[PDB]
C-alpha cells in the first residue's frame, strides 16, 4: 500500500496576515481510510500571532478523508506523486485569504508545504480581536473539471456572543498525474482546535472528513 492504514504527516506553513509574517510547523497523524486525523502545531516565527488561529486551521490534509468504494478517491490516487491546491477564503466583511499547497509523501508520512496571504481583516473585527470560536461542521461540494477537482464550501466561524461570521471557500485541487475522476460528491467535515497553550504558540487540532454522493 502506497497509503497505509496508519500514517503521519509534517506541515510547513508560512505567510502574512494583515502584513504580519509568521511560520508554523506541525506533526500530524491519523487513519486515512477512516477520515480521522490530529495535528500538533508549533509557531516557529512571528509568534504569538496577533490574529485568530481559526483562519489557519483549514490549511493545516485531504488524504485523511474516508471515501466509499464507489467514489474514486482523487487524493489518495495521486500518490506517490501527490497533488497541489489553491484556495481563497472570502469573508463576509471583505477580508480575503489566499492559500496554496504542495502535498508529497515520504514513506508513511505526508509532507505539506502551505503558503497563506490574508488581507484586510478589520482591526476591530473578530479575527484581529481574537473573538472567533471555531468553525461549524461543513459540507464541501466537489466536481471534476479538466482533471482537477473543484470544491466550494459555505463556511461559518462561531463568535463570542453567539453570532456567526461567514466565509466562502473556493478550492481547486490538482493531482500531479492523471487519476480516475469522481462524479459530483460532497465531503462532510468537523474541524476543532482541541487544546492550545495560552498564547497559541502550541496548538492541537483534529478533523473528521467523510465523502458521500451528492443528492
Amino acid at each position: 500500500s502506497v497509503i497505509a492504514k496508519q500514517m503521519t504527516y509534517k506541515v510547513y506553513m508560512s505567510g502574512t496576515v494583515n502584513g504580519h509574517y509568521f511560520e508554523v510547523e506541525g506533526d500530524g497523524k491519523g487513519k486515512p481510510y477512516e477520515g480521522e486525523q490530529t495535528v500538533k502545531l508549533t509557531v516557529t516565527k512571528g509568534g504569538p500571532l496577533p490574529f485568530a488561529w481559526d483562519i489557519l486551521s483549514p490549511q493545516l490534509s485531504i488524504p485523511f478523508t474516508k471515501y466509499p468504494e464507489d467514489i474514486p478517491d482523487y487524493f489518495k490516487q495521486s500518490f506517490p506523486e501527490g497533488y497541489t491546491w489553491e484556495r481563497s477564503m472570502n469573508f463576509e466583511d471583505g477580508a480575503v485569504c489566499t492559500v496554496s499547497n504542495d502535498s508529497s509523501i515520504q514513506g508513511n508520512c505526508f509532507i505539506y508545504n502551505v503558503k497563506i496571504s490574508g488581507e484586510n481583516f478589520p482591526p476591530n473585527g473578530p479575527v484581529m480581536q481574537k473573538k472567533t470560536q471555531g468553525w461549524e461542521p461543513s459540507t464541501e461540494r466537489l466536481f471534476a473539471r479538466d482533471g482537477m477537482l473543484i470544491g466550494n464550501d459555505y463556511m461559518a466561524l462561531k463568535l463570542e456572543g453567539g453570532g456567526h461570521y461567514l466565509c466562502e471557500f473556493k478550492s481547486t485541487y490538482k493531482a500531479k498525474k492523471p487519476v480516475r475522476m469522481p462524479g459530483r460528491h460532497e465531503i462532510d467535515r468537523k474541524l476543532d482546535v482541541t487544546s492550545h497553550n495560552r498564547d497559541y504558540t502550541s496548538v492541537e487540532q483534529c478533523e473528521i472528513a467523510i465523502a458521500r454522493h451528492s443528492l
Side-chain angles (χ1 to χ4, degrees), residues 20-23 43-50 199-201:
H20 186 88
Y21 183 75
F22 68 96
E23 303 172 4
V43 177
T44 47
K45 193 155 161 192
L49 309 175
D199 63 15
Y200 287 84
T201 48

Side-chain angles (χ1 to χ4, degrees), residues 17-60:
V17 176
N18 274 29
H20 186 88
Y21 183 75
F22 68 96
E23 303 172 4
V24 173
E25 301 198 348
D27 299 308
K29 60 183 168 176
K31 300 199 195 299
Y33 303 95
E34 307 306 321
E36 300 170 349
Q37 61 183 315
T38 57
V39 66
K40 300 196 183 176
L41 296 321
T42 299
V43 177
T44 47
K45 193 155 161 192
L49 309 175
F51 59 78
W53 185 267
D54 282 331
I55 72 173
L56 308 185
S57 71
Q59 330 318 328
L60 288 158

